[PDB]
Amino acid sequence: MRAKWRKKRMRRLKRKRRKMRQRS
Amino acid sequence: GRVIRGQRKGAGSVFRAHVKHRKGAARLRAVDFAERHGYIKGIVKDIIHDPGRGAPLAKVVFRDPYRFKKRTELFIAAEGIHTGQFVYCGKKAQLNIGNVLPVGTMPEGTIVCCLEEKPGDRGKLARASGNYATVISHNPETKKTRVKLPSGSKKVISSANRAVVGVVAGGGRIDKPILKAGRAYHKYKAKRNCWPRVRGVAMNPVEHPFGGGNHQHIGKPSTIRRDAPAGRKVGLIAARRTGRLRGT
Amino acid sequence: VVDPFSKKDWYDVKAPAMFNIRNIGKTLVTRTQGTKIASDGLKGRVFEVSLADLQNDEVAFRKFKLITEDVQGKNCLTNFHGMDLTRDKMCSMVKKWQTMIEAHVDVKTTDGYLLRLFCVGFTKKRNNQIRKTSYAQHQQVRQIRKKMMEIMTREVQTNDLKEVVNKLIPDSIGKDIEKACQSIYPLHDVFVRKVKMLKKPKFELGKLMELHGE
RNA sequence: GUGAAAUUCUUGGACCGGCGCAAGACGGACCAGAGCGAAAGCAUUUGCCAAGAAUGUUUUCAUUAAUCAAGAACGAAAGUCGG
RNA sequence: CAGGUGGGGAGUUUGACUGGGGCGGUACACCUGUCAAACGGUAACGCAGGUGUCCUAAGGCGAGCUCAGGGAGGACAGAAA
RNA sequence: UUGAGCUUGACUCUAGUCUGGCACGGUGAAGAGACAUGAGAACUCUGAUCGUUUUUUCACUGACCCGGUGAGGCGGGGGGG
RNA sequence: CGGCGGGUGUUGACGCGAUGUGAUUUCUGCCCAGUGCUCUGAAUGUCAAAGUGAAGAAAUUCAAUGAAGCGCGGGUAAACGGCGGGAGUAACUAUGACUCUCUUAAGGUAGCCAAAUGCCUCGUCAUCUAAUUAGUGACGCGCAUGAAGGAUGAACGAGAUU
RNA sequence: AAGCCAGAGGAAACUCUGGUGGAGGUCCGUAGCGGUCCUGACGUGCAAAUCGGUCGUCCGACCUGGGUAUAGGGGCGAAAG
RNA sequence: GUCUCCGUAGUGUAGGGUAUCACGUUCGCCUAACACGCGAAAGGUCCUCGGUUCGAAACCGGGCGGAAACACCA
Ligand SMILES: [Mg+2]
Ligand SMILES: [Mg+2]
Ligand SMILES: [Mg+2]
Ligand SMILES: [Mg+2]
Ligand SMILES: [Mg+2]
Ligand SMILES: [Mg+2]
Ligand SMILES: [Mg+2]
Ligand SMILES: [Mg+2]
Ligand SMILES: [Mg+2]
Ligand SMILES: [Mg+2]
Ligand SMILES: [Mg+2]
Ligand SMILES: [Mg+2]
Ligand SMILES: [Mg+2]
Ligand SMILES: [Mg+2]
Ligand SMILES: [Mg+2]
Ligand SMILES: [Mg+2]
Ligand SMILES: [Mg+2]
Ligand SMILES: [Mg+2]
Ligand SMILES: [Mg+2]
Ligand SMILES: [Mg+2]
Ligand SMILES: [Mg+2]
Ligand SMILES: [Mg+2]
Ligand SMILES: [Mg+2]
Ligand SMILES: [Mg+2]
Ligand SMILES: [Mg+2]
Ligand SMILES: [Mg+2]
Ligand SMILES: [Mg+2]
């Protein structure tokens, strides 16, 4: 991928991870 | 089958304004020879808080031009005026904050505080706190002045209408959140019986068009025509549009 | 169905006495019908006409507006409204490696005409100059702008619009501006680039008729 | 309007031309391997307000300096909040 | 005075039968066969169905023919011309 | 074939509202026509005068309406500057 | 009931009046076909009384004209409200990223869930118990979740539950 | 809670510590006001709605006397017809 | 249970006088080849049976299925 889009994908995944952890 | 709230407000019985501690009608001085041809000087003797309104009122004392007496007025305080200040009212008054002079004599960009709707009544426009009108344009022929009101509308008035120079005091009163039902109660207790407002959907069908149902829903379009009978025109009255106001 | 040009009748457009060619040309308007007056239709028209076809042997890059105030008989009669340089002349004057100074001033004549004047000047390189560019420093530019703003007001405030127009016909104002500025930085292409009417005084018909006739 | 079209606007006068009015943006050409600023950045006129480099100096103080963990100010655009 | 709008308000109505009522159905006006007990009559929300039409002829008269089906034959022709 | 509370796309109305007409309800012009004496040519078609006819536009004030005031200097003119 | 009567109003858009949602945080997706509301009358179709013209002896009849409204045309969903099917398809099976069509005004987005909303149902898995139609966590083709209300989040509650 | 004093640390920006102060539709809890649960008592009662214990709130949208105003398809309603 | 609707190429669908559209399938082009594209072709007891009609996929009854909607007050 383009590095910028890998960065964007990582940011989306990190928001999802934060939401999952906050749910606990 | 029951008269609704809002219909009951016109009879006035419980819904008359609470005017017990109000300090008087806030008005310019009546136009006379001094206003019409020169100026008359008064002194701001006090600035007071009128219950029910957010604008301070200015108690100004003038000299009676025809008999030995002192005339006290209750101007609406333009912001920046202070006690012990001289304010001048008439055609030959100068542009200063608090002076009263006809709009036709004012330049093409000045802004004004207590504007007259008709040439000779006292102030009627831009009276609420923080508000002002703007003198846009003149034409010496037909003696007309075009002004911009706080609502953004444009109005043509006579050039002989008087107004106070400046913005009315009381600042950005609506900026502070009320934060409390108690503060709202104390706010409206000084104004009138209107505050604790029950939603119509929470009522029964007998006292509201929107009342009733097993779920709290309106059940009919909330926009209502202009010529609807009283007891029916509740909701968005003659609305040209609904929604979110995206763009203007 | 019938062509509307059957109901059009022609009028002759007349320039003031400042120009020795009085015939601007011809215009047309629909004949009077009902409340619609051909006089009202003809009034308020602007005729962007060059200077070479208004004055006998003047330059061609200068245009005059010549708005119509009053029509009598078959003659529309015009009066000064503004002037402008032409697009090609203005674009040819702008060149690289030189500084142009632009000034504007609002000034009232003796007879109540308010004018906005726009003047341009361009830095001139000397004949023996080896350096490519001819740039004036900012203080020199400010002094030149101030000079050419204060020697446009004294040619307008102290005289009538008639002898303002007849002296901006040869651009005497630009010539004296250029002569004055030589002690600060030399200038070569100095013109009153534009003038526009801002306000007019009440349209005295006697004044219009003395502008046209005598 | 496009490669071509179409969505769209049009005998209700659209586009075009003329004269006005209003609003909010934007400061062309001049504009450069030019300037200034710690960088980010900075271009309509005029005025006010402090600031600054370089230069000039047979002025003054006399080592008061250089770089700098921690800490501090500013920091395009996008984004967020209130008007 | 006229037209529009007008549950804001007024007055009123919101069929019947029915193995309770409602939903369903129409057994609510008719016609055929049966029920039906060899005169006639005879019931269920009994059974099997049909009707709110169609026809200047599909009405009227006269004349002349014979229908469905099958068998046997006949160029194309065949299960059917 | 008794009601009442409430709703509405039931039936029949109704307060209020929107709109047209008539009356209060006038005075001048300017348009465009139908106006009415008329005039050009039963001999074949055009310019006018005052009233009237509509419809529009503009203006006036005197009916009518609003605001201010203890109805306190309004309009025109003459001084004097 | 009525008077140019009265309330808001001793008021003037930072104000009155009418609604919906309901602190904060974070979001508030698509649909103007329907029903409403509203804007524009443009040649405009329909359109009462009065008024105009004609026929008649008159009653009367006919015709022309064309107010609002309705039609015609735009806007609007933090207006009422609404937000789909049927097949095939990946080198074990299984699902279906993907592909076809039918159709809508748009086909339910972000989220959330057997939830106070899930029939089937005591759903399936995990945890809690010796044993749980209960509780919690998770899953989701969800009979019939869902965005001015969705999802959260401290503090609080004579609220419901383990 | 803000405001204030002192000490200490900092180059500054400011920070830390101890006091002071006394805010709040703040907490516990009298009187008052209310009325959760026992589904207690009583239920031909003390009472045509009361009593006991337990409870909610208790500086505020607080409690309350008197004087006024609003009247029946009307009033008034922080909304339960 | 009651009421209503549907059954058409392999697929999703249109429709009383010789069954349409699109995809799919076949063949030939183009390409080194596949796909795309281009030119042609094939394909359907119109669910089953009976009836009306000169003639039924249609119209009308019966049956096979499939799909919706009701299935309430005690
Ligand atoms: Mg509310
Ligand atoms: Mg309720
Ligand atoms: Mg109602
Ligand atoms: Mg309701
Ligand atoms: Mg609904
Ligand atoms: Mg930025
Ligand atoms: Mg913002
Ligand atoms: Mg009723
Ligand atoms: Mg017998
Ligand atoms: Mg018998
Ligand atoms: Mg016979
Ligand atoms: Mg009976
Ligand atoms: Mg009844
Ligand atoms: Mg109806
Ligand atoms: Mg609210
Ligand atoms: Mg109409
Ligand atoms: Mg929209
Ligand atoms: Mg979902
Ligand atoms: Mg679920
Ligand atoms: Mg549950
Ligand atoms: Mg247990
Ligand atoms: Mg769970
Ligand atoms: Mg939404
Ligand atoms: Mg408390
Ligand atoms: Mg407490
Ligand atoms: Mg008990
Ligand atoms: Mg109830």
Span CA (A2) to C1' (I30), Å:
37
Q: Which two tokens stand for residue C68?
A: 């119509």
Q: Contact at 8 Å (CB) between B125 and B166? A: no
Q: How many CB atoms lie within 10 A of CB A24?
A: 4
Nearest residue to C16 (alpha-carbon basis) of C169, C212, C214: C212
Q: Please name the method used to determine this structure.
A: cryo-EM
- Where do we find the tokens 């530019």? C141
Long-range pairs for B135-139: beta carbons < 8 A, 24 or more residues apart:
B135/B103, B135/B106, B135/B107, B135/B108, B135/B109, B135/B110, B135/B111, B136/B108, B137/B108, B138/B104, B138/B108
What is the whole-number distance in angstroms between the Cα of residue C203 and the centre of ligand 18?
Answer: 75
The torsion angles phi and psi of B60, rounded to 5 degrees, stand at: -120, 135
- CB-side exposure of B30: number of CA atoms within 13 Å? 5
Q: Contact at 8 Å (CB) between B132 and B79? A: no
What is the whole-number distance in angstroms between the Cα of residue C107 and the centre of ligand 27?
Answer: 80
d(CA A2, CA C141): 52
d(CA B214, CA B211): 10
Q: Contact at 8 Å (CB) between B23 and B48? A: yes
Q: In which order are the strands placed within the sheet that holds C62-64?
A: C49-50, C62-64, C82-85, C191-199, C114-122, C100-108
Name the DSSP class of C159. S
Neighbours of chain A (3+ CB pairs under 8 A): none
> What b/e sequence results for C162-194 when a residue is b if at least 16 CB atoms lie within 10 Å of its CB, and e otherwise?
bebbbebbebebbeebbebbeeebbbebbbbbb
- What torsion, rounded to 10 degrees, do the Cα atoms B66, B71, B77, B83 define? 110
How does strand C191-199 pair with strand B56-63?
unpaired
d(CA B26, CA B19): 13
Q: How many CB atoms lie within 10 A of CB B15?
A: 14
d(CA C81, CA C198): 9
Span CA (C164) to C1' (E36), Å:
130
Q: What is the DSSP string of C100-116?
A: EEEEEEEEE-TTS-EEE
d(CA B48, CA B17): 20
Would you tell me the crossing angle of helices C138-153 and C172-181 to the nearest 10 degrees? 140
**How many residues in chain A?**
24
Would you tell me the crossing angle of helices C172-181 and C161-168 to the nearest 10 degrees? 70
> B10: burial class by Cβ within 10 Å (0-12, 13-18, 19+)?
exposed
d(CA C65, CA C84): 8
Does any strand D atom come closer than 7 Å to the Cβ of C102? Answer: yes
How does strand C8-14 pair with strand B236-237?
unpaired
Q: What is the DSSP string of chain B?
A: --PPTTTTTTT-TTTS---SS------PPPP-HHHHHSEEEEEEEEEEEPTT-SSEEEEEEEE-SSSS-EEEEEEE-BTT--TT-EEEEETT--S-TT-EEEGGGS-TT-EESSB-SSBTB---BS-STT--EEEEEEETGGGEEEEE-TTS-EEEEETT-EEEBS-BSSTTGGGS----HHHHHHHHHTT-S--S---GGGS-TTT-TT--SSS----S-SEE-TTPPTTT--SEET-S--S-----
Span CA (A16) to C1' (G131), Å:
40
Q: Which nucleotide is nearest to A15 (CA to C1')?
A: G26
Resolution in A: 2.7
d(CA B92, CA C210): 39
Q: Which nucleotide is nearest to B11 (CA to C1')?
A: G7
- Where do we find the tokens 């009546």? B30
Nearest residue to B27 (alpha-carbon basis) of B91, B71, B74, B62: B74
The one-letter amino acid at B75: F
Span CA (C143) to C1' (D60), Å:
37
d(CA B8, CA C109): 67
**How many residues in chain C?**
214
Q: Contact at 8 Å (CB) between B53 and B19? A: no
Q: Which nucleotide is nearest to B233 (CA to C1')?
A: G18
- What torsion, rounded to 10 degrees, do the Cα atoms C154, C157, C159, C162 define? 110
What is the whole-number distance in angstroms between the Cα of residue B116 and the centre of ligand 10?
Answer: 107
Q: In which order are the strands placed within the sheet that holds B144-148?
A: B111-112, B133-139, B144-148, B154-158
Q: Which two tokens stand for residue C161?
A: 């619009």
d(CA C120, CA C164): 18
Q: In the 3-class helix/strand/coil scheme, how is C33-88 assigned residue by residue?
A: ECCECHHHHHCCCCCCEECCCCCCCCCCCEEECCEEEEEECCEEEEECCEEEECHH
What is the whole-number distance in angstroms between the Cα of residue B125 and the centre of ligand 20?
Answer: 60
Q: How many CB atoms lie within 10 A of CB B36?
A: 11
Q: Which nucleotide is nearest to B37 (CA to C1')?
A: F73
Q: Which two tokens stand for residue B40?
A: 């008359």
Nearest residue to B121 (alpha-carbon basis) of B166, B147, B157: B157
Q: Contact at 8 Å (CB) between C161 and C65? A: no
> What b/e sequence results for B95-130 when a residue is b if at least 16 CB atoms lie within 10 Å of its CB, and e otherwise?
ebebbbbbbbbbeeebbbbbbbeebeebbebbbebb
Q: Which two tokens stand for residue C121?
A: 């000047």
Nearest residue to C187 (alpha-carbon basis) of C134, C139, C150: C134
Q: Contact at 8 Å (CB) between B103 and B157? A: yes
Q: Contact at 8 Å (CB) between B92 and B77? A: no
What is the whole-number distance in angstroms between the Cα of residue B243 and the centre of ligand 5?
Answer: 20
End-to-end alpha-carbon separation of chain C, Å? 47
Residue C140: helix, strand or coil by DSSP? helix
Q: Contact at 8 Å (CB) between B164 and B100? A: yes
CA angle B16, B19, B23 (to 5 degrees): 160
What is the whole-number distance in angstroms between the Cα of residue A4 and the centre of ligand 6?
Answer: 21
d(CA C127, CA C139): 24
The one-letter amino acid at C26: K
Q: Which of chain G's bases lie under 7 Å from a protein CB? A: 6-22, 32, 35-39, 75-81, 112, 137-138, 149, 152-153
- What torsion, rounded to 10 degrees, do the Cα atoms C53, C56, C61, C63 define? -50
| Residues lining strand E, beta carbon within 7 angstroms | B 1-2, 209, 227, 229-232
